[PDB]
Amino acid sequence: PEMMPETANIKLGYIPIVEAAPLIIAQEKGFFAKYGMTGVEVSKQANWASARDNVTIGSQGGGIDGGQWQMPMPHLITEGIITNGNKVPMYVLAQLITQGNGIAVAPMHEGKGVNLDITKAADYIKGFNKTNGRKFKAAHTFPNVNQDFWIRYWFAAGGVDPDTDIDLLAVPPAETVQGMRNGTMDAFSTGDPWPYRIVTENIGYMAGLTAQIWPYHPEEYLAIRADWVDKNPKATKALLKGIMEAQQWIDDPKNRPEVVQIVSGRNYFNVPTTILESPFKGQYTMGDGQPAIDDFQKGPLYWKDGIGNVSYPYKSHDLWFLTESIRWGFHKNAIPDLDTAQKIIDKVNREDLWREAATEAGFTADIPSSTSRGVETFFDGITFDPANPSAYLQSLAIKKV
């Protein structure tokens, strides 16, 4: 009775990328059912804009109650920043995964130094219009969120202003790939399974994995509408527990072949298992004369990483996402300062529910002791101290603040 979800039903959206694994596995391996959530519908979203629209309308309107998200979408939706003023409060409940993302670059840029650190290739990229007829063109999967941040950080770390020196745009994943094939797209912030296909099919090479840019960086999260969570507190915790067990299950190498088999299935990603087998072993052919990566720790991780617990949603990570938003001058009026960012974070991040669910499920030993993971370090030496985001912003060379 006390654990009995108020409802066993919920519609959770997902995008066909490795970040969705916990949702798919929690469902397919019976982890959701174990806790009473036998009516979970893991619904594939056409794209991020559609996922946003669907959670804004909610399940009662034919959309979704929550699901998988790039950060800080839950916060932006809560504030109605990306919903034309339609504020739909949401709660960030857990981080689904870390890594499993990367930046692909067109083959025409090989031997140019456009790798992890593009410093020496900065002028080349900056003068691409002069030398090649068009501004260097890069793409992400939705503005102002994860992929946009990853590619922006990467560019900026090397001296390339992503807003002024290049054409950074949101472009469908397929179109972008086709663009690189055609010779019109120069790079794109992607993630698995897209990277394997790009290298294998000689479409391009991997300049770097986000695992290299920011080891064990916060990635995508499970977030559900606040009205749903408020009305169904027990069901919410049941979902969290199913997710946690799924994440733990996925991280055991012995289960990864099955994980790959399931998510690649027709009813989910619908892709050849061969393209995900490597990444789930932490194996990536990088290309451009760079050594291949063969490290489980650099592949996608869903439960524990080299720093702490992956699933626990650290508020310090929400803070980085909003701080980086401020860095690029995103939502100038809605999030004009760090204090406002923090206020939004305290309304959105429900790490307390993760703690409670983990405790009830018997994962007390895995619960981080703090809402902050501490000072974060990027591949270029820049550090983000959650206690002083202002210092972080001021340490950055390229920014709009």
Binding residues for Ca ion, rule: CB under 5 A, are 101, 146, 191
The answer to whether the beta carbons of residues 68 and 16 sit under 8 Å apart is: no
The answer to whether the beta carbons of residues 25 and 259 sit under 8 Å apart is: yes
d(CA 216, CA 298): 8
The answer to whether the beta carbons of residues 204 and 107 sit under 8 Å apart is: yes
Q: How far is the CB of 77 from Ca ion (least distance, A)?
A: 17
Q: Which is nearer to Ca ion, 159 or 191 (CB)?
A: 191
Q: How far is the CB of 67 from Ca ion (least distance, A)?
A: 14
d(CA 316, CA 319): 5
Torsion of CA 227, 229, 233, 237, to 10 degrees: 180
> What separation, in Å, do the N-terminal and C-terminal C-alpha atoms of the chain show?
52
Residue nearest to Ca ion (CB): 191
Distance from the Cα of residue 197 to its chain's centroid? 19
Cα 72 to Cα 14, 143, 236, 344, distances in angstroms:
16, 11, 20, 10
Q: Which is nearer to Ca ion, 54 or 146 (CB)?
A: 146
Q: How far is the CB of 155 from Ca ion (least distance, A)?
A: 17
The answer to whether the beta carbons of residues 55 and 77 sit under 8 Å apart is: yes
Q: Which of 90, 91, 125, 126 is nearest to 105 (CA)?
A: 125
The answer to whether the beta carbons of residues 300 and 62 sit under 8 Å apart is: no
Q: How far is the CB of 15 from Ca ion (least distance, A)?
A: 8
For the chain, how big is the Rg over CA atoms in Å? 20
Q: Which is nearer to Ca ion, 211 or 348 (CB)?
A: 211
Q: Which of 284, 309, 271 is nearest to 17 (CA)?
A: 271
In eight-state DSSP terms, residue 202 is T
Q: Which is nearer to Ca ion, 165 or 192 (CB)?
A: 192
Q: Which is nearer to Ca ion, 78 or 101 (CB)?
A: 101
Q: How far is the CB of 220 from Ca ion (least distance, A)?
A: 5
Q: How far is the CB of 275 from Ca ion (least distance, A)?
A: 16
Residue with tokens 């670059």: 105
Q: How far is the CB of 19 from Ca ion (least distance, A)?
A: 5
**Nearby residues of 203 by Cβ (< 8 Å), 6 or more positions away:** 104, 107, 177, 180, 181, 197
Q: Which is nearer to Ca ion, 100 or 179 (CB)?
A: 100
Q: How far is the CB of 23 from Ca ion (least distance, A)?
A: 14
Q: Which is nearer to Ca ion, 14 or 330 (CB)?
A: 14
Q: Which is nearer to Ca ion, 210 or 236 (CB)?
A: 210
